[PDB]
Design a protein around this ligand. Structure first.
Ligand SMILES: [Cl-]
Ligand SMILES: [Cl-]
Ligand code: NA
Ligand code: NA
Length: 391
């Protein structure tokens, strides 16, 4: 019969936030990027369509307040171009401008813009004042366009190509409303979830390719959102907040989450040889962090899947990959494969390993650094997932 008409919001796109100024122990300080009477137009792919949308902006890692002078949305027509007939003001309690204190985030009012799954929209922000923006998604695998003055409603961004970025600035979620029964799959992890070495602007991250499989099978109401951070670790900050500290924000608190795919840990193992020798961790400490995250998500009724850690022999031998890192990887993967607490294993390691040597990534799936997959490898990761488990 008729689907009950109650409308609800669902996360359609996400980006986990990092503090661009945080550095490793013993490292030199790093400056945040700043805007000053400038517009940044972001482009993002929606996983879920629907009738209205809202934008979640962020000053989570600011050291002082920031003011979004204007925020607007429109359908993207490629590069920095928009369909101006779809341009809409994004308001916050009815106001076009909004100030976020340091450490806070805010979701906008609903915007009356009907949107379709697997389409791109542009989210444009104008900062009239000098604005430090340490709160970023560093590796967006997507071009952002920066121009002078308030260009938020302009058909394109007029500026030099050298001003472009591949980050997201203070933009962390896009939610879209629907009356339909809807699942939301959160992919949580590091660069291999984030999509590092997949083709920029091509939507070839593994969660994108999983999304493609779902829609091709007819499940337009099963969404996939990306909560990967390149360089992320379970147990220590950098790159990005530790996985254990961000799990509530980036997984449990995602609007409409029903399923989580967790793939995290290789950087806990790889960072201690050289990047961060004071942060050596054991497989047992990684397993303890995973355990607590699994317990919390299951207590919320979320279906929890854990991926095995993909082989990475050859990745900066002696300085990231080591015999100690491999032994920890083996222990962690054995724990994952035999766990009765999780709803299922996704054996990414088995799917991507080299038939000639299981400690290395399959050459056809290797971006070239022995650690990050290429587009074909991210396609193979998505192909290894049982879609009946996301129902
Ligand atoms: Cl307006
Ligand atoms: Cl690169
Ligand atoms: Na900060
Ligand atoms: Na959240």
């Amino acid at each position: 019969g008729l689907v009950p008409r109650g409308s609800h919001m669902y996360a359609s796109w996400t980006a986990s936030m990092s503090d661009a100024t945080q550095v490793l122990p013993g490292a030199a300080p790093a400056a945040s990027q700043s805007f000053n009477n400038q517009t940044v137009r972001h482009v993002l792919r929606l996983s879920l369509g629907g009738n209205t949308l809202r934008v979640k902006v962020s000053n989570l890692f600011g050291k002082s307040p920031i003011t979004f002078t204007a925020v607007r949305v429109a359908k993207s027509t490629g590069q920095s171009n928009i369909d101006v007939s779809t341009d809409k003001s994004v308001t916050f309690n009815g106001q076009a401008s909004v100030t976020l204190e340091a450490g806070t985030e805010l979701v906008s009012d609903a915007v009356n813009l009907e949107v379709a799954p697997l389409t791109n929209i542009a989210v444009s922000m104008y900062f009239s004042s000098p604005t430090a923006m340490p709160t970023v998604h560093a590796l967006g695998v997507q071009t952002a366009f920066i121009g002078a003055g308030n260009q938020t409603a302009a058909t394109s961004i007029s500026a030099a190509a050298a001003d472009q970025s591949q980050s997201y600035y203070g933009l962390t979620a896009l939610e879209v409303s629907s009356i339909q029964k809807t699942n939301v799959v959160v992919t949580f992890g590091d660069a291999i979830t984030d999509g590092y070495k997949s083709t920029v602007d091509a939507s070839k991250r593994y969660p994108n390719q999983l999304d493609d499989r779902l829609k091709t099978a007819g499940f337009s109401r099963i969404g996939v959102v990306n909560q990967g951070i390149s360089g992320n670790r379970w147990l220590n900050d950098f790159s990005g907040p530790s996985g254990t500290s961000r799990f509530d924000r980036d997984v449990l608190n995602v609007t409409g989450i029903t399923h989580a795919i967790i793939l995290l840990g290789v950087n806990d193992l790889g960072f201690s040889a050289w990047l961060a020798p004071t942060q050596t961790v054991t497989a047992e400490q990684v397993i303890a962090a995973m355990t607590t995250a699994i317990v919390k998500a299951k207590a919320k009724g979320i279906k929890v899947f854990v991926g095995t850690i993909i082989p990475f022999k050859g990745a900066s031998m002696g300085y990231y990959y080591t015999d100690a890192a491999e032994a920890k990887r083996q222990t962690i993967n054995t724990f994952i494969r035999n766990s009765k607490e999780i709803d299922g294993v996704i054996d990414f390691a088995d799917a991507l390993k080299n038939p000639a040597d299981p400690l290395t990534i399959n050459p056809i799936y290797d971006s070239g650094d022995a650690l990050h997959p290429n587009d074909a490898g991210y396609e193979a990761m998505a192909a290894a997932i049982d879609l009946s488990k996301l129902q």
